[PDB]
Symmetry: C3
């Protein structure tokens, strides 16, 4: 909605004429993972406010930025600060950047996010390779593809069964081994809820019964739009808290030093994404 094809094109063209960079891979940084932009080399920064047609920031803190550069050698463009539905953005604004990435000539999207753990076996700071998703907003009509289809992007009714690239998953699992980590790289299903409130125990139990392994309030729309455009997609959730799944466990004690360990866990995810650039196929 709201944007014409020309808008997307005008934006891609503007970016293309104001940077010499030509990215192949786009990375969307989740909450706490913005430090990935510091890992880029020969970086060139664009504040959203400079970029024509880019949705204005409505939220506290600085407007986000698009950072171009190389990540372990690979030509990348990186979004720091994503738009969320819960902040009152429509989905067509949330996913505006993904369409622009396509027109930039990007062929791969990496998504990161911070998630609540639903699978009992997960621990705070685990990384979960996303194998699949459940789109709750989507079932009810909040789907970023709603409205007339543009065949210049893709098909009317795109398949999502193969959303998370199988080759990249095999290669993530295989690269993880060489890094010799304490814990295994987890694999499972991300469920999107609109938020912003956190789940009740009842709601946490439904989400488990539905087969979700991790929950958050982002990502899925970007992935749907990415696949519509024929982008290759892989992604990771950093598990930032275990979701409370019983009333007995409302005998709960908080330890505020869970935030130094979380900087370390974010850092591990940032460096794992970085290294995986070696394993993405070239165009």
């Amino acid at each position: 909605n709201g944007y014409t094809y020309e808008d997307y094109k005008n934006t891609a063209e503007w970016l293309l004429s104001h940077t010499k960079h030509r990215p192949q891979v786009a990375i969307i940084c989740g909450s706490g993972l913005g430090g990935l932009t510091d890992k880029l080399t020969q970086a060139q920064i664009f504040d959203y406010g400079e970029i024509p047609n880019f949705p204005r920031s409505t939220v506290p803190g600085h407007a986000g930025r698009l950072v171009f550069g190389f990540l372990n050698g690979r030509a990348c463009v990186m979004m720091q600060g994503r738009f969320h539905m819960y902040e009152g953005y429509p989905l067509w604004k949330v996913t505006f950047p993904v369409r622009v990435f396509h027109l930039l000539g990007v062929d791969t999207l990496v998504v990161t996010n911070a998630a609540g753990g639903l699978n009992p076996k997960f621990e705070v700071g685990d990384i979960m390779l996303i194998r699949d998703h459940i789109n709750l907003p989507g079932f009810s009509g909040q789907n970023p593809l709603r409205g007339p289809n543009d065949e210049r992007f893709g098909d009317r009714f795109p398949a999502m069964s193969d959303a998370y690239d199988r080759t990249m998953r095999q290669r993530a699992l295989s690269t993880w081994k060489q890094m010799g980590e304490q814990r295994e790289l987890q694999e499972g299903t991300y469920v999107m809820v609109a938020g912003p409130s956190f789940q009740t125990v009842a709601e946490c139990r439904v989400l488990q019964k539905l087969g979700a392994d991790a929950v958050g309030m982002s990502t899925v729309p970007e992935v749907i739009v990415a696949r519509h455009c024929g982008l290759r997609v892989f992604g990771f959730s950093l598990i930032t808290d275990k979701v409370i799944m019983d009333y007995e466990s409302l005998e709960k004690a908080n330890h505020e030093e869970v935030l130094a360990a979380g900087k370390q866990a974010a850092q591990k995810l940032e460096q794992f994404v970085s290294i995986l650039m070696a394993s993405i196929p070239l165009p």
Copy 2:
């Protein structure tokens, strides 16, 4: 902003009265043709066509109404339905059903093309719709949202008896005596908003929820119809099997079209 109804009662009545004075036909039955089943209109006798663009207040397509007799029965047939995924609000989607009621229709037949969730189902099957699951409805996308007009129905219409019991018995028995190679399957249709297809994980929740087939239509129309007091029955043509783990059609539509014709005889009189 969601479900901001632009239609007054007067608008619905103006449309019904325009159609009533531009054709002598007086339908008892309205039939909504799903994707690939528009050829049902060729079966009508004594037909008159109205393009949607010609009829007042009717939503514009991106479409026609055909009146006629189907196997002797006074019908109105909708060829080219509106879908939520195209960006139509549900009050535009179900506008035709309001109009049909004011035309005099007492029965709605809904047909659609669906994905198979029940593993028993095969491509080309016909599923008699026993019940539904309205996922959009749970969250707010219900075509009855807004002030209720008692001229149409109650504030809180019951939906447990949505798919007429008698018609389900007569469809099961009429099929039996057609002696078909395939059994007439029966189950729950789940509506999702669309337009993207299900992931393996979403296909599995839909199965867990007890749905046998999935699609992106029909349910709003059924709800509006029951609000109005219409008898309802319907069928899904199974066009694909939904992928549920991590690993021709023209003829089958024709079989449905012909089964719908035959079943006109089983519908009670007004």
Copy 3:
């Protein structure tokens, strides 16, 4: 603001109310359908129609009543707003924010629900222990949009929505009441409505672990918790939801009355600053 109210708006309303009433309420009660008879038990009552009150959404019935109930200063809302009537949730929950800025610290919610737990009988009272916010899952959450920290957190916890202390005291007051039916306890699921559930829909609500279903309340509770209001509430079971294909107005007036009297009794058991 577009699609909402600013802090200034809610404050303007609360200040207006506060300079047009003598009452300073501690407890707010939002009455469900058929349960508004409590308002006639308020002493030193003072009544405002919604159209009287700045920024208040106009019902399309509906009033606000301040007074004392069983020794406690209350504000009572008769004729709540529902999503199915076409109201956005930021209108539905507008009064809860006003109540907070009035100085209320406790919200009592009642509603009329369909029974999904097979054990529940028509006329039963269910103490709400938890909820499932179906519309919340998909976008319809009253906190959607810009957040003001004068009300609460960006990502508020709802694990503890239904106050544990009141829950125990309700159970305890019921035991001493001598009532013959047990006081039921379970999860309320909100559906947007207005159409009632199919058999298939009822069965998913059951599999999801919900004990009773209705079309209200959850939004008010979320906004209340976001505000730090203490919350407890009750569902009167008005019908058993048809759960299989097998397929009274005066008994429900008595059952409603019983709920009204239970809320009035419990005024005495709410903590007091």
